Amino acid sequence: FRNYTSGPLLDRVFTTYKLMHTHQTVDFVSRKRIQYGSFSYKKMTIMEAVGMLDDLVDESDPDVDFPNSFHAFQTAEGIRKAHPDKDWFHLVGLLHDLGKIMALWGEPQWAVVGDTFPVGCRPQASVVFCDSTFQDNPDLQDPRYSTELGMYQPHCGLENVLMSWGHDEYLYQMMKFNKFSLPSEAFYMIRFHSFYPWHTGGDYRQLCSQQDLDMLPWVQEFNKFDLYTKCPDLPDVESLRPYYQGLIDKYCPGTLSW
Numbered sequence: 353f354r355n356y357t358s359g360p361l362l363d364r365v366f367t368t369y370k371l372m373h374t375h376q377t378v379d380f381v382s383r384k385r386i387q388y389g390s391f392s393y394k395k396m397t398i399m400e401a402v403g404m405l406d407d408l409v410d411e412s413d414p415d416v417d418f419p420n421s422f423h424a425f426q427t428a429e430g431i432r433k434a435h436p437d438k439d440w441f442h443l444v445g446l447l448h449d450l451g452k453i454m455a456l457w458g459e460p461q462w463a464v465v466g467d468t469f470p471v472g473c474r475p476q477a478s479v480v481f482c483d484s485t486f487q488d489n490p491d492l493q494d495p496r497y498s499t500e501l502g503m504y505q506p507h508c509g510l511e512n513v514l515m516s517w518g519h520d521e522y523l524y525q526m527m528k529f530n531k532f533s534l535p536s537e538a539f540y541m542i543r544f545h546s547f548y549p550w551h552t553g554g555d556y557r558q559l560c561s562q563q564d565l566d567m568l569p570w571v572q573e574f575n576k577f578d579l580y581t582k583c584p585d586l587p588d589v590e591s592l593r594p595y596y597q598g599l600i601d602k603y604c605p606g607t608l609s610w
């Protein structure tokens with residue numbers, strides 16, 4: 353799992369992180385936040401959006417080579433079986449990767465999927481391929497962003513950090529805009545679930561607040577289902593749909609703005 357030294361997909365995953373690192377700059381993230389922050393691209397229900405991902409495969413994932421819609425159901429199912437008393441958490445599983453619809457809207461996948469990292473400051477060691485994929489990034493030539501803290505004050509809190517643009521931040525802002533009625537923990541887990549250097553690699557604590565640290569266990573708990581439920585054996589989506597539609601009706605019903 354999560355093997356970046358070996359694997360049959362390693363070729364397309366290295367290409368995709370080298371290209372996203374080489375191009376996720378402060379300006380770019382700043383533009384994309386505006387480009388998508390009005391959620392005026394499409395109107396859809398959750399299940400519509402999930403079904404859109406019937407038409408999408410993730411090019412950064414070394415563990416998956418099937419429509420990402422299925423992965424949504426697998427993650428929700430893993431969570432549901434381990435945390436029966438937390439239905440909202442089951443939904444988070446289904447919802448967490450819906451931001452990848454951007455790839456169907458013409459975005460290059462390096463601007464949609466993959467591990468995230470803060471722009472505006474020096475990449476730390478636990479960033480996938482850090483040593484070999486950042487040399488062509490203009491921000492690093494910029495004294496404003498080349499240092500450890502870069503443009504940030506210490507412990508500013510991750511909510512005040514500009515993350516590399518992708519499905520995490522898109523979906524987080526989407527849910528705020530539509531006013532999903534999930535607990536704070538849900539919004540936070542989704543917003544930072546891709547931030548491996550932080551929740552796994554132990555890095556970027558120079559930017560974290562005590563609030564962020566307190567959320568670490570929640571992100572890590574979601575993460576283990578996010579990652580380890582990935583399997584070629586697909587779920588019976590038709591059978592599962594009604595259960596998850598019930599949760600959708602409770603937490604984020606009807607047509608939403610994307």
Ligand SMILES: O[C@H]1[C@H](O)[C@@H](O)[C@H](O)[C@@H](O)[C@H]1O
Nearest residue numbers: 412413449465466467545546
């Ligand atoms: O390849 C995976 C996939 O893109 C996940 O959706 C994302 O959250 C992870 O950070 C990434 O490593």
Ligand SMILES: [Fe+3]
Nearest residue numbers: 448449545546
């Ligand atoms: Fe994800």
Ligand SMILES: [Fe+3]
Nearest residue numbers: 423448449578
């Ligand atoms: Fe995922």
Ligand SMILES: [O-]
Nearest residue numbers: 448449545578
């Ligand atoms: O994920």
